[PDB]
Write a protein that binds this ligand. Structure first.
Ligand code: VBY
Ligand code: CL
Ligand code: CL
Ligand code: CL
Ligand code: ZN
Ligand code: ZN
Ligand code: ZN
Ligand code: ZN
Length: 312
């Protein structure tokens, strides 16, 4: 018998005395060591005193798991640990003062999301995500990346979309203050305002231009005609404008950052463009700069606080 610490959150630790003859599994159920599944493994001497994640198997641990992760999904832990087993081997170089990810395991979308998250104002509701976000920002992003995979229901190597990933993370964030008022104007039906809150207040799919959204865009009306959707009022610290990739000109100082996407649906490559004193293009570990940019953009992020249109 050695003694170990079991946990679900790596905050509340529980002392166990484990049989050196019995597997971890026989004694605790599914058991992980820094991401690596050790259910079917017996305890080695150098395991003495270390901390293992266990699957919750009593009320105390289920409550601590919900309080840390904001999920009761029993697969969540195993998916988090399977992802961490890879993300702990990725490299996280600082590029232009941001934690990036050196390319591995089709991670371009995760690196682009990670870089974006360091440039917009967001508070995560699950303490697991908030703690890992602070650690990632200071250069240790392995846990954060594994949690992004677990929360998005994605595995390492799976092809991912930055807009879809940001959408899932925003659903785990405090965006309640965020408010969007839209006006739709049709010839026949007339004018209808609607108010959106939370995630739907900060995301739009259909144009990259925040300015064009303010001037209005042409959308189908239930009557059958085209109509004009325009932005009446925005209350959020940022907005995310997305569209199917298309050649687009990015101007220094007119946006926060953007997702570049090159190639076919699903199996292309993301890079990240950020507006500093000049335009930086972050491609995992690679960095280029230029004063101008035109290329295939699918997401553009902008700063906001309070906007009210000058349209009656
Ligand atoms: C829901 C299923 C799904 O697999 N989604 C998903 C997963 C992973 C990726 C990389 C993408 C994706 O290719 N995203 C880019 C940005 C994209 C977005 C929209 C329209 C597009 C049209 C042409 C080309 C790219 C287009 C989508
Ligand atoms: Cl715990
Ligand atoms: Cl929740
Ligand atoms: Cl949540
Ligand atoms: Zn406990
Ligand atoms: Zn929650
Ligand atoms: Zn891997
Ligand atoms: Zn109508």
């Amino acid at each position: 018998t050695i003694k170990v610490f079991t946990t679900v959150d790596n905050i509340n630790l529980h002392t166990q005395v484990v049989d050196m003859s019995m597997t971890y599994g026989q004694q605790f159920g599914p058991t992980y060591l820094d991401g690596a599944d050790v259910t079917k493994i017996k305890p080695h001497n150098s395991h003495e005193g270390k901390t293992f994640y266990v699957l919750p198997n009593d009320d105390t641990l289920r409550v601590e798991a919900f309080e840390y992760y904001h999920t009761t999904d029993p697969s969540f832990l195993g998916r988090y640990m399977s992802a961490l087993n890879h993300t702990k081997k990725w490299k996280y170089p600082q590029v232009n003062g941001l934690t990036s990810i050196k390319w591995a395991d089709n991670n371009s979308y995760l690196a682009t999301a990670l870089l974006t998250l360091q440039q917009i104002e967001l508070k995560f509701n699950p303490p697991a995500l908030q703690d890992a976000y602070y650690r990632a920002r200071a250069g240790e992003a392995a846990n954060f990346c594994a949690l992004i995979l677990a929360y998005c229901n994605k595995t390492v190597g799976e092809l991912g979309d930055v807009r879809e990933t940001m959408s899932y993370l925003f659903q785990h964030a405090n965006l309640d203050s965020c408010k969007r008022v839209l006006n739709v104007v049709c010839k026949t039906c007339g004018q209808q305002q609607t108010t959106l809150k939370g995630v739907e207040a900060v995301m739009y799919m259909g144009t990259l231009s925040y300015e064009q959204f303010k001037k209005g865009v042409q959308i189908p009306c239930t009557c059958g005609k085209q109509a004009t959707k325009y932005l009446v009022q925005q209350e959020s610290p940022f907005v995310m404008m997305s569209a199917p990739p298309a050649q687009y000109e990015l101007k220094h100082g007119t946006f926060t950052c953007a997702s570049e996407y090159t190639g076919n649906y699903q199996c292309g490559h993301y890079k990240h463009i950020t507006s500093k004193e000049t335009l930086y293009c972050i491609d995992g570990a690679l960095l280029t700069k230029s004063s101008e940019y035109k290329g295939p953009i699918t997401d553009v992020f902008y700063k906001e606080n309070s906007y009210t249109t000058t349209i009656k």
